[PDB]
């Protein structure tokens, strides 16, 4: 159902995963805060 | 074992005589519980 008329005020607290190194398995939650690294050089946790 | 959100348990409280290791013998293990918390535990630690 729509949350547009309530959750939207907009609302940054509803978040999604733009990148993952693979595709999730069923009901697999990724809570890791690891940055997505597209280079060979270590991100060292920083962007 | 974690399967379909189910951690599972199987147990036998059973007597033996050995100091060293698993005594040879065969006892099936019935289930006790199965809490479907859906929390994959790739690792674990006993508590002593």
UniProtKB/Swiss-Prot annotation, chain A:
Region annotated Immunodominant HLA epitope recognized by the CD8+, chain positions: 11-19
Entry superkingdom: Viruses
Effect of residue 16 to F: Decreased HLA binding to NF9 epitope. Increased binding affinity to human ACE2
Record region (Disordered): 18-47
Outcome reported for the amino acid change (mutating residue 47 to A): In strain: Omicron/BA.1, Omicron/BA.2, Omicron/BA.2.12.1, Omicron/BA.2.75, Omicron/BA.4, Omicron/BA.5, Omicron/BQ.1.1, Omicron/XBB.1.5, Omicron/EG.5.1
Effect after changing residue 47 to D: Increased replication in human TMEM106B overexpressing cells
Region (Receptor-binding motif): 2-47
Biological role stated in the UniProt entry: Attaches the virion to the cell membrane by interacting with host receptor, initiating the infection. The major receptor is host ACE2. When S2/S2' has been cleaved, binding to the receptor triggers direct fusion at the cell membrane. When S2/S2' has not been cleaved, binding to the receptor results in internalization of the virus by endocytosis using host TFRC and GRM2 and leading to fusion of the virion membrane with the host endosomal membrane. Alternatively, may use NRP1/NRP2 and integrin as entry receptors.
Oligomeric form and interacting partners: Binds to host ACE2. RBD also interacts with the N-linked glycan on 'Asn-90' of ACE2. Cleavage of S generates a polybasic C-terminal sequence on S1 that binds to host Neuropilin-1 (NRP1) and Neuropilin-2 (NRP2) receptors. Interacts with host integrin alpha-5/beta-1 (ITGA5:ITGB1) and with ACE2 in complex with integrin alpha-5/beta-1 (ITGA5:ITGB1). May interact via cytoplasmic c-terminus with M protein. May interact (via N-terminus) with host bilirubin and biliverdin, thereby preventing antibody binding to the SARS-CoV-2 spike NTD via an allosteric mechanism.
Protein name from the UniProt record: Spike protein S1
Organism encoding this protein: Severe acute respiratory syndrome coronavirus 2
